[PDB]
Design a protein around this ligand. Structure first.
Ligand SMILES: CCCCCCCCCCCCCCCCCC(=O)OC[C@H](COP(=O)([O-])OCC(O)COP(=O)([O-])OC[C@@H](COC(=O)CCCCCCCCCCCCCCCCC)OC(=O)CCCCCCCCCCCCCCCCC)OC(=O)CCCCCCCCCCCCCCCCC
Ligand SMILES: CCCCCCCCCCCCCCCCCC(=O)OC[C@H](COP(=O)([O-])OCC(O)COP(=O)([O-])OC[C@@H](COC(=O)CCCCCCCCCCCCCCCCC)OC(=O)CCCCCCCCCCCCCCCCC)OC(=O)CCCCCCCCCCCCCCCCC
Ligand SMILES: CCCCCCCCCCCCCCCCCC(=O)OC[C@H](COP(=O)([O-])OCC(O)COP(=O)([O-])OC[C@@H](COC(=O)CCCCCCCCCCCCCCCCC)OC(=O)CCCCCCCCCCCCCCCCC)OC(=O)CCCCCCCCCCCCCCCCC
Ligand SMILES: CCCCCCCCCCCCCCCCCC(=O)OC[C@H](COP(=O)([O-])OCC(O)COP(=O)([O-])OC[C@@H](COC(=O)CCCCCCCCCCCCCCCCC)OC(=O)CCCCCCCCCCCCCCCCC)OC(=O)CCCCCCCCCCCCCCCCC
Ligand SMILES: CCCCCCCCCCCCCCCCCC(=O)OC[C@H](COP(=O)([O-])OCC[N+](C)(C)C)OC(=O)CCCCCCCCCCCCCCCCC
Ligand SMILES: CCCCCCCCCCCCCCCCCC(=O)OC[C@H](COP(=O)([O-])OCC[N+](C)(C)C)OC(=O)CCCCCCCCCCCCCCCCC
Ligand SMILES: COC1=C(OC)C(=O)C(C/C=C(\C)CC/C=C(\C)CC/C=C(\C)CC/C=C(\C)CC/C=C(\C)CC/C=C(/C)CC/C=C(\C)CCC=C(C)C)=C(C)C1=O
Ligand SMILES: Nc1ncnc2c1ncn2[C@@H]1O[C@H](COP(=O)(O)OP(=O)(O)OP(=O)(O)O)[C@@H](O)[C@H]1O
Ligand SMILES: [Mg+2]
Lengths: 231, 58, 256, 67, 77, 54, 108, 60, 140, 96, 54, 49, 99, 41
């Protein structure tokens, strides 16, 4: 499609794609004991254990509001690890960061836990909303199954199993029913099904170039005055 | 994620993005071409200071 | 004993060392188990951030001064500096120079109280490097498998026996100090691989080094003993013996 | 190969003898820009393409050079 | 071109119609109308080019455990 | 010239194009991930025929 | 002393092992219960957790679960050394022996 | 295993009370002169450092 | 739709019956007039002033959260929490104080709300019919 | 009752300083100015975030899943996604 | 055997935050400000005419 | 000219003379984790991601 | 659309160009960013940035007259707090060892 | 689906009990007005 044409896009004064130690005039320089009288520094060697305790708190303090949902605790754990594995797998050389990446990430995670302790972190609220929307749909299926009724998801699974038999019952010259064929059969069913639903307009433009919004009503004028409520 | 950057006051654009491509496009012709360091917070200050036998910490 | 301690249950020996980046303090202390939404209090009360900074930063800081108040009750802090502050306070209205000479001995008293009430912090990295050099300890202990069960380290009160340490029988040094600046403690260690345990008892004192007026090491282990205990073997290691260490170096006797 | 073959070829990239004496546009179009025409965005693309040919698409030379 | 006409007729030159209908409405739509902030049944488009990870086998078990043959596969693996 | 403001237009005009070509750029990234996925599914097509081969 | 379990409140129970054989059976049940653990039957006393799909962060979740079941208060300085099944067993003994002699729990 | 990840290159200094104990005060500064008398010796003996002395005499 | 619109409906319930059922369809002009003054859901009934407040309330509040969420000047004095060198720590409580002062933006708007206006010259002009007076009128 | 409450007076402030009535004008302007400056800084991080999360990926590197992408995949999948997974499973893993 | 499959009763609901709503979101972003801004300026005033008003 | 000289001296130079950053580090556990983490992902890289 | 509206383009890239200079390591950008806004109405008078404040008071340069004082006081305190950060050794940080 | 309200083909009683997105916002605002009774009081 389109690729960045500038070959020097990732160049910095410090090197190629360097976002760990940008070049600045006041660069780090060494210190010599025999000549150093006093010093004021905030660096220390406590980040490793603070990285550990921070993980335990963020996990244990967020589980307070999961109500024993084991599947959510396990899903949240996978998401929590993705937040702590950022420095271990990033392109950025987190080991060469300016003034210590270890202290930087730890202090950054602490600001997240502060919000987690109050149950105000956006990832928490995002989790509650996403889960409630999920359980409502699983309960809708349960109520339909207890009534002996068939779910919309099973009607497709059953409608797709038969469509495969019809295709392989005529596919006798060959006998390699690829995953590609299996896929485009389902998509042909999904498009037909989705179009059947009364969904809000998602694409800007319909079959014509014109937009599918309620505002795309141009001339000619054929609508009369609006009518009132009926008694 | 945008709320997370705001509530943690990580309002330096592209600090938590491993490849701040938007940051390279804006600095293509900048003086002192540089991008923000990874996970840089606008409040952290790692400045130090020392006193030596010479003046100005030298 | 750790002076700076809050109601937080975890990481007691690191509470004063760890510098958190929090804007305010967490709503609840670190949980020891998963709790219920009703176990905590949503939307904490008004003026809660100011309350936490008092019970988590101010109060444990004053408990430290009160725990180690026996180290600041010297004639220099109690009589000299206050008396020097009052002599010039009677003339504070005559000029600004008296206000300064009346407040300086008070800022000086705070500095000595501040430094003397802090928990005694030795260079633990020098210690672990010392024990991991001994083959009798590395036979059962390794940094990747060692864990701390208990830690105690506190100053020794009052002047010591005036035969082992005749240095502290100095009326000039006593005028500035009421304690010795020495510390004694132990370390309960365990190894998750060998299952071994040992009690690393040690005594420390400040010593002079390589210079005339400045101290060399405020916490020098002149006695370092380890009573190692394993499945069925009991060993006693002596890394530093006091009978042989006190013949070569003597304490420093801090002034001011 | 054929791509690099013609790039290196002097004949394919060679100014005519009188090219030096000709009137030369010494701008890429960034000095006076059309801001309100419907092809506005198309104009910027031609400026970007002209700046790139001058530097072999290594725009660091433009950043370092004189404007 | 840079000479498109008068200022009053400027909003006229933007429309490009896909049909031969006359007269043609001049207004060229800028955005899509979004009156109601509806939660889209559509799945998020961020899930686009993410390499294989732990979420793939965790979700496979959840779907396999929905079948009798799948419960055997998971427990044995 | 003081081209600072122009540099901000050139980058925005370039991003305008990258957004217009989002579908193509992403579809090409998946064409390689699908290649990797299709390659791993070849091991299952071989095992399903072992019972018939035997 | 109560916790939610699938939306229902349940009273939590604390365990007292005080026996080497019961400790090995507990840790194995603990590790096998973790959803990230592989080769649950190939797990033994001398099994490295890295060989079963566990990292440093998974050793924390395991310790966090030990505090739930046994009532321990484990410090962050002790967690990063728990990298084997044998390590969880010896740590549990060191805690029980420490409380039997010193009359108090280890420093947290 | 925090000592495993501790870098010994921080041992270049021995910081205590905002002062490096590995400072050759015998060769540089107000403390280098060894011809100092009873008063000057007792003065440095109290403070141990010229930096703290100069700072206090600044306000005095 | 809002409660005030529903209140109008219960009061105009019989009026709606006369316009929409009888007049809106009788014939001729009485129809055009009844279909023009029909009663129902308001076409373009949104209130931009309400929306203007909702937008400006949200935008100004996002600014309050930034200005009020600052690191403490008091905690940075000890050099023991998160701040060793902060040469502009004395600017920490300027924006918070500036936002809290914004609560008096409307309480103290104009000169009359900052003092006792009858002791000021502009009050005399208002009582004289918004008429220009010599500057020394408060003395004579 | 104390005299400290006299500071609440503005009827007779012209007898002491007459300065409050003018300084708060600046404070209202200073707040307004910062509201426009800070709101622009903190709000305008979204274009960069919206772009990078959608165009910064490359095929020569691994794109790692975030927290949100984990929850959305496991706890926010739609019906067609559930059908397609089981449709593939039943056909190939069960029915071959 | 597969036809015999049944379903387990899932949880009734997750945690409901008592201080977060769709119209009064607890946390801040330019997304909600944009939603309120467009409610204020209203929808794009599309002209249905063949010629511009001026 | 005086505008630049003001900020280049009051802030940029003033702080370059009286403040600095240390080159010595106290903790280097990211370097060794990235190596071990890269061996855990050795197979996925073999697939060229 | 942040890629077609030049108003958000100018403000977005301008702010990004200002915050990226935190790598110059002056001090916390979260602290001194507010002073930059005040200093802008001191030297921005040359560019008429104070125009929108002409009806807000009887003095068009009111905000500029206060900002120059603000700019002076807080810059006067920057060295004072820096010495407070050095401690009692602050004289050694300046001159070094005595003679 | 087809029972969805239409502003033209609407009954009087139905409009009185519509309770659309506009009211849903107001009910959220009212939830805050009530919860602020002690703070304001
Ligand atoms: C007149 C107006 C008065 C108004 C009074 C107002 C009220 C005042 C009250 C308040 C007083 C201020 C408070 C001070 C204390 C505050 C704390 C403090 O600051 O620290 C102390 C502070 C420490 O001093 P320092 O500089 O840090 O020490 C230097 C080294 O560190 C030291 O190094 P060191 O210790 O290793 O050894 C030092 C010395 C070794 O010293 C020793 O070892 C000697 C020790 C002897 C001890 C004696 C013991 C006595 C015991 C008591 C007696 C026995 C008991 C018997 C009892 C009997 C009972 C009846 O070695 C040397 O060789 C030194 C260099 C040689 C001397 C240089 C002198 C230069 C003077 C130039 C002027 C010359 C004038 C000559 C003509 C004068 C004729 C009038 O003391 C001072 O600052 C002293 C004042 C300095 C001011 C100088 C500016 C004035 C210049 C001189 C005057 C010039 C003349 C001007 C007019 C002339 C008109 C004719
Ligand atoms: C009796 C009733 C029953 C009571 C019993 C119940 C008791 C329960 C109490 C419950 C809670 C009480 C709350 C307080 C306890 C807090 C404890 C705690 O741990 O909190 C830590 C807490 C933790 O920090 P955070 O939670 O992260 O954030 C806290 C704040 O949000 C923001 O934190 P921040 O640190 O960022 O805020 C800094 C701000 C804090 O705001 C203030 O405190 C205002 C400070 C104004 C005084 C500054 C003194 C300067 C030194 C002058 C030395 C002479 C003094 C002479 C005084 C004579 C007075 C006439 O101060 C500044 O702005 C620093 C810059 C100062 C201006 C720069 C220039 C300074 C030099 C100017 C010299 C001019 C001289 C010219 C001529 C000289 C010629 C000699 O920090 C606090 O300090 C909390 C303070 C909360 C506000 C309290 C005040 C509320 C307003 C009440 C109305 C005014 C009445 C008091 C007026 C006092 C005199 C003006
Ligand atoms: C006692 C009896 C008194 C009351 C009697 C009652 C009746 C009173 C009259 C009320 C009239 C209401 C209905 C007409 C209103 C709109 C008229 C109009 O031309 O707008 C159509 C025009 C586009 O309509 P279109 O043909 O469908 O094209 C659509 C395209 O999207 C457009 O974009 P495009 O780029 O694609 O196409 C080109 C675009 C070209 O136009 C534009 O794109 C922008 C035009 C410049 C906008 C003005 C910028 C001014 C900056 C603010 C400074 C003044 C603020 C006012 C308050 C200051 C303090 C007093 O539009 C055009 O096609 C040609 C433009 C025609 C002239 C435009 C300028 C008209 C004056 C607007 C400002 C009036 C205030 C200043 C006048 C002096 C005040 C004493 O829209 C605008 O011009 C919007 C600007 C705001 C218009 C409303 C402003 C208030 C009413 C203005 C009445 C104008 C006559 C009086 C002033 C003229 C003095 C020289
Ligand atoms: C209109 C006025 C305009 C002027 C405006 C100026 C405003 C300035 C505002 C700046 C902020 C000031 C606030 C100070 C906060 C202090 C807080 C505190 O106490 O913490 C302690 C803190 C020290 O802690 P550290 O350094 O972090 O660590 C200490 C070490 O651990 C310690 O290590 P070590 O244990 O080895 O050291 C030993 C010992 C050594 O100490 C000694 O040197 C010993 C001295 C001799 C003592 C006497 C010995 C007597 C011996 C008697 C022997 C008897 C023998 C008997 C024998 C017995 C016979 C039986 O050192 C100490 O412990 C003492 C250090 C603390 C001294 C604090 C002095 C403060 C004096 C301030 C007085 C005036 C305050 C007025 C405030 C007014 C506010 C409204 O003090 C400081 O940091 C001082 C920094 C202040 C620098 C400010 C510089 C600002 C510029 C000022 C002049 C600018 C002129 C240019 C003007 C241009 C226009 C703008
Ligand atoms: C518009 C309304 C609001 C306006 C608000 C103000 C917005 C300001 C926009 C950002 C301005 C940023 C200026 C940074 C200049 C840095 C240039 C550089 O990197 O040097 C590279 C230069 C040049 O390298 P170069 O590679 O980047 O550029 C090369 C230039 N050519 C092409 C010509 C060769 O080299 C250096 O490193 C020299 C560094 C000198 C730095 C002197 C500037 C110091 C001023 C900044 C400190 C100000 C702090 C103020 C805090 C106040 C608090 C109260
Ligand atoms: C005679 C009239 C009295 C004049 C008024 C004097 C007011 C004195 C009290 C207010 C000022 C207190 C000092 C504030 C500045 C220090 C901030 C701070 O708290 O830091 C704590 C710090 C905490 O250390 P930190 O803040 O550096 O952080 C520690 C490390 N981290 C961050 C990792 C946790 O500790 C101390 O500073 C030591 C204790 C300070 C002592 C302060 C004085 C208290 C006085 C108590 C009086 C008791 C008797 C009278 C009252 C009886 C009550 C009924
Ligand atoms: C607290 O923190 C802060 C915020 O929160 C985050 C902010 O949003 C903000 C920003 C503030 C805003 C965006 C609001 C700005 C408002 C401004 C500028 C003024 C608004 C003016 C109007 C809307 C016009 C009003 C006109 C009038 C009142 C004149 C006519 C009188 C009318 C309409 C009311 C009649 C008068 C009465 C006394 C009767 C009252 C009637 C009632 C109470 C009936 C109510 C009926 C129902 C059904 C509720 C700030 C400054 C802040 O500090
Ligand atoms: N080599 C150094 N270089 C620069 N700053 C240092 C250095 N060493 C210490 N500092 C600063 O002085 C502080 C105190 O150092 P200190 O050795 O007492 O810490 P520590 O945690 O007790 O070490 P240990 O675990 O070995 O006992 C440190 O927190 C640091 O800010
Ligand atoms: Mg120590």
């Amino acid at each position: 499609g389109y690729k960045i044409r500038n070959k020097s896009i990732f160049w910095t004064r410090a090197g190629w794609k360097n976002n760990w130690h940008p070049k600045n005039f006041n660069a780090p320089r060494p210190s010599y004991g025999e000549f150093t009288m006093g010093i004021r520094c905030r660096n220390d060697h406590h980040s490793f254990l603070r990285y550990v305790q921070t993980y335990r708190n963020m996990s244990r303090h967020c589980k307070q509001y999961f109500l024993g949902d084991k599947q959510l605790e396990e899903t949240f754990i996978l998401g929590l690890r993705s937040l702590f594995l950022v420095p271990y797998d990033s392109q950025c050389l987190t080991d060469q960061i300016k003034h210590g990446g270890e202290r930087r990430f730890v202090d950054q995670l602490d600001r997240d836990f502060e919000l987690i302790s109050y149950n105000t972190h956006p990832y928490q609220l995002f989790t509650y909303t996403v889960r409630n929307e999920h359980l409502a749909w699983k309960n809708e299926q349960y109520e339909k199954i207890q009534k002996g009724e068939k779910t919309f998801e099973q009607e497709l699974l059953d409608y797709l199993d038969e469509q495969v038999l019809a295709e392989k019952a005529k596919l006798r010259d060959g006998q390699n029913f690829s995953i590609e064929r299996m896929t485009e059969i389902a998509l042909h069913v999904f498009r037909k099904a989705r179009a059947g639903k009364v969904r809000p307009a998602q694409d800007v433009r319909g079959p014509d170039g014109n937009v599918n919004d309620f505002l795309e009503q141009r001339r000619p004028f054929e609508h009369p005055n609006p009518t009132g409520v009926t008694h | 994620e945008l709320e997370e950057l705001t509530e943690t006051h990580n309002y330096i654009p592209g600090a938590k993005d491993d490849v701040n491509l938007r940051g390279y496009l804006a600095t293509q012709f900048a003086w002192g071409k540089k991008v923000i360091s990874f996970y840089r917070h606008p409040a952290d200050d790692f400045k130090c200071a020392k006193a030596t036998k010479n003046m100005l910490g030298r | 004993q750790m002076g700076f301690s809050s109601d937080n249950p975890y990481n007691k020996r690191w509470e004063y060392k760890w510098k958190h980046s929090y804007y305010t303090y967490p709503r609840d202390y670190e949980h020891t188990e998963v709790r219920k939404p009703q176990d905590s209090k949503d939307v904490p009360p008004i003026y809660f951030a100011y309350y936490k900074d008092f019970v988590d930063r101010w109060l444990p800081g004053m408990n430290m001064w009160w725990q180690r108040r026996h180290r600041i009750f010297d004639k220099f802090n109690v009589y000299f500096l206050p008396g020097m502050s009052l002599f010039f306070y009677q003339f504070a209205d005559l000029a600004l120079g008296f206000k300064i000479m009346a407040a300086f001995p008070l800022f000086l008293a705070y500095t000595r109280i501040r430094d003397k009430t802090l928990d005694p912090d030795f260079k633990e990295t020098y210690l672990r490097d010392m024990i991991y050099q001994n083959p009798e300890i590395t036979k059962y202990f390794n940094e990747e498998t060692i864990h701390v069960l208990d830690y105690e380290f506190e100053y020794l009160p009052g002047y010591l026996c005036p035969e082992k340490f005749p240095e502290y029988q100095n009326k000039t040094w006593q005028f500035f100090n009421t304690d010795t600046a020495q510390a004694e403690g132990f370390f309960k260690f365990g190894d998750v691989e060998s299952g071994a345990t040992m009690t690393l008892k040690f005594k420390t004192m400040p010593i002079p080094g390589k210079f005339r007026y400045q101290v060399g090491e405020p916490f020098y282990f002149y006695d370092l003993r380890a009573e190692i205990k394993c499945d069925g073997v009991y060993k006693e290691v002596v890394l530093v013996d006091e009978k042989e260490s006190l013949k070569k170096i003597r304490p420093f006797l801090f002034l001011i | 190969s054929l791509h690099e073959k013609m790039q290196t070829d002097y004949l394919w990239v060679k100014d005519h003898s009188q090219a030096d004496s000709w009137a030369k546009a010494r701008t890429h179009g960034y000095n006076y820009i059309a801001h309100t025409v419907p092809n506005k965005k198309e104009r910027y693309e031609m400026i970007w393409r002209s700046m790139g040919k001058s530097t072999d698409w290594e725009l660091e030379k433009f950043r370092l050079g004189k404007k | 071109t840079l000479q498109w006409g008068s200022l009053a007729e400027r909003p006229m030159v933007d429309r490009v119609m896909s049909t031969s209908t006359w007269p043609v409405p001049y207004y060229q739509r800028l955005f899509k109308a979004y009156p109601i902030r509806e939660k889209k049944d559509k799945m998020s488009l961020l899930l686009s080019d993410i390499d294989i990870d732990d979420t793939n086998w965790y979700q496979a078990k959840d779907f396999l455990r929905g079948s009798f043959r799948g419960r055997q596969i998971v427990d044995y693996v | 010239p003081l081209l600072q403001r122009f540099y901000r237009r050139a980058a925005a005009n370039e991003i305008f194009t990258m957004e217009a070509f989002y579908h193509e750029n992403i579809e090409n990234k998946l064409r390689n991930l699908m290649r990797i996925t299709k390659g791993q599914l070849e091991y299952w097509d071989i095992h399903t025929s072992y019972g018939e081969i035997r | 002393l109560t916790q939610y379990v699938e939306g229902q409140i349940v009273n939590r129970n604390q365990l007292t092992l005080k026996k080497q054989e019961d400790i090995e059976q507990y840790v194995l049940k603990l590790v096998r219960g973790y959803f990230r653990t592989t080769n649950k039957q190939g797990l033994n006393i001398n099994s490295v957790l890295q060989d079963h799909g566990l990292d440093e962060f998974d050793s924390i979740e395991l310790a966090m679960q030990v505090e739930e079941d046994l009532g321990y208060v484990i410090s962050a300085e002790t967690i990063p050394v728990l990298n084997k099944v044998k390590h969880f067993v010896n740590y549990i003994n060191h805690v029980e022996q420490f409380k039997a002699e010193n009359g108090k729990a280890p420093i947290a | 295993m925090w000592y495993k990840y501790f870098s010994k290159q921080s041992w270049n200094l021995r910081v205590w009370r905002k002062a490096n104990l590995k400072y050759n005060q015998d060769d540089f500064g107000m403390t280098q002169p060894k011809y100092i008398a009873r008063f000057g010796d007792f003065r440095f003996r109290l403070v141990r450092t010229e930096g703290a002395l100069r700072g206090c005499m600044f306000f005095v | 739709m809002n409660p005030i619109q529903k209140a109008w409906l219960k009061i105009l319930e019989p009026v709606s019956y006369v316009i929409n059922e009888k007049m809106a369809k009788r014939t001729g002009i009485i129809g055009k007039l009844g279909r023009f003054f029909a009663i129902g859901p308001r076409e373009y009934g949104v209130h931009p002033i309400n929306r203007m407040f909702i937008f400006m309330n949200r935008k100004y509040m996002a600014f309050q959260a930034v200005a009020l969420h600052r690191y403490s000047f008091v905690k940075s004095l000890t050099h023991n929490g998160f701040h060793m060198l902060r040469v502009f720590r004395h600017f920490a409580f300027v924006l918070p104080a500036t936002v809290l002062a914004g609560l008096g933006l409307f309480v103290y708007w104009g000169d009359d709300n900052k003092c006792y206006s009858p002791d000021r010259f502009p009050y005399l002009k208002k009582r004289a019919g918004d008429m220009a007076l010599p500057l020394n009128s408060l003395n004579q | 009752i104390l005299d400290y409450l006299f500071l609440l007076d503005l009827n007779d402030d012209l007898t002491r300083k007459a300065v409050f009535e003018q300084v708060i004008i600046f404070i209202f302007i200073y707040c307004t100015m910062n509201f426009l400056a800070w709101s622009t800084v903190v709000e305008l991080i979204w274009p960069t975030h919206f772009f990078n999360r959608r165009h910064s990926s490359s095929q020569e590197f691994i794109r790692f899943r975030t927290y949100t992408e984990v929850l959305l995949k496991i706890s926010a999948y739609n019906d067609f996604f559930y059908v397609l997974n089981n449709y593939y499973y039943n056909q190939k893993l069960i029915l071959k | 055997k597969e036809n015999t499959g049944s379903m387990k009763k899932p949880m009734a609901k997750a945690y409901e935050h008592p201080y977060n709503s769709e119209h009064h979101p607890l946390n801040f972003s330019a997304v909600k400000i944009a939603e309120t801004f467009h409610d204020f300026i209203g929808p794009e005033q599309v002209s249905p005419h063949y010629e511009s008003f001026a | 000219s005086q505008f630049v000289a003001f900020f280049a001296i009051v802030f940029w130079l003033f702080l370059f003379l009286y403040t600095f950053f240390i080159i010595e580090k106290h903790e280097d556990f990211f370097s060794k984790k990235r190596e071990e983490r890269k061996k855990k992902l050795k197979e996925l890289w073999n697939l060229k991601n | 659309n942040p890629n077609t509206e030049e108003n958000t383009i100018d403000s977005d890239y301008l702010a990004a160009s200002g915050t990226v200079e935190a790598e110059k390591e002056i001090t916390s950008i979260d602290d001194y960013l507010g002073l930059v806004f005040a200093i802008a109405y001191v030297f921005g008078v040359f560019f008429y940035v104070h125009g929108w404040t002409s009806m807000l008071s009887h003095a068009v340069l009111l905000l500029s007259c206060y900002s120059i004082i603000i700019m002076f006081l807080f810059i006067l305190g920057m060295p004072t707090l820096l010495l407070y950060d050095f401690g009692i050794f602050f004289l050694a940080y300046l001159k070094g060892a005595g003679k | 689906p087809q029972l969805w309200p239409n502003p033209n083909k609407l009954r009087f009683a139905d409009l009185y009990k519509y309770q659309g997105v506009e009211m849903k916002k107001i009910n959220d605002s009212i939830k805050n007005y009530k919860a602020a009774k002690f703070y304001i009081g």
